[PDB]
Amino acid sequence: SKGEELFTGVVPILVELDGDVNGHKFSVSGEGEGDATYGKLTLKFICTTGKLPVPWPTLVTTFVQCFSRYPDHMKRHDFFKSAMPEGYVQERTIFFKDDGNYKTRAEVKFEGDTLVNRIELKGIDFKEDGNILGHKLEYNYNSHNVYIMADKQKNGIKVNFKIRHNIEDGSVQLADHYQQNTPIGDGPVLLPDNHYLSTQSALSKDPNEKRDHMVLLEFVTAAGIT
């Protein structure tokens, strides 16, 4: 396809985010690379404004599904790569159960050989003593299924899934994700049949890094269609 070929090898990745959660302003820069052939992502994020005001796990989904591995028989359902190199807009509302919500708007596209994800995040109605602003979430991550449906109305896709973050007391903090993606260019894109992405993520720390940061290793494969 017009974008499939752009992901046959290792692609450098850059992530830039500006956020405001209940008035707490912060920025994050991330770098790494992705190898869609194997659905693999390796990235390191740094809070460039000091200490991150929310827990790192809560931003993982916000921080390039074009790196998902789509089985050859499912290639016609790969909206993400089809929108490249012009890219796509990714918007979400993430509802943290019994707490506030994040609204995000991002643009994912190529700048030369680098795949860039530029994001604006706004969080409101959070409890200053809740699990988010109170930093009560464990630094870990679970495997999830990301459900995708076409949206011919806007020539894009609708995505939904639930992330369950582990709370330090053994409980769980649900983060309900509502997502929409639309192409940036006026070119054609692939509208998919219903399917999902199987995702797994591991979080770690750089032992020599004194800045507030997160190291992420992720594997994602499309499934649901035979």
Tell me if 69 sits within 8 A of 82, measured CB to CB.
no
Cα angle for residues 105, 106, 112 (degrees, 5° grid): 160
Pairing of strands 195-204, 144-151: antiparallel
Given a contact cutoff of 8 angstroms between Cβ atoms, the answer to whether 18 and 121 are in contact is: yes
- Return d(Cα 209, Cα 202) in angstroms, integer: 18
Which residue from 111, 69, 86 is spatially nearest to 2, judged by alpha carbons?
A: 86
Q: Which of 21, 85, 87, 89 is nearest to 59 (CA)?
A: 21
Kindly tell me the burial class for residue 151, based on how many C-beta atoms sit within 10 Å of its own C-beta (0-12, 13-18, 19 or more). Answer: middle
Phi, psi (deg, nearest 5) at residue 181: -130, 135
This entry's atomic model was obtained through: X-ray
Yes or no: say if 85 and 6 are a contact pair by the CB < 8 Å rule. Answer: yes
Domains assigned to the chain: 1-226 (2.40.155.10)
What tokens appear for 131 in the block?
Answer: 């699990």
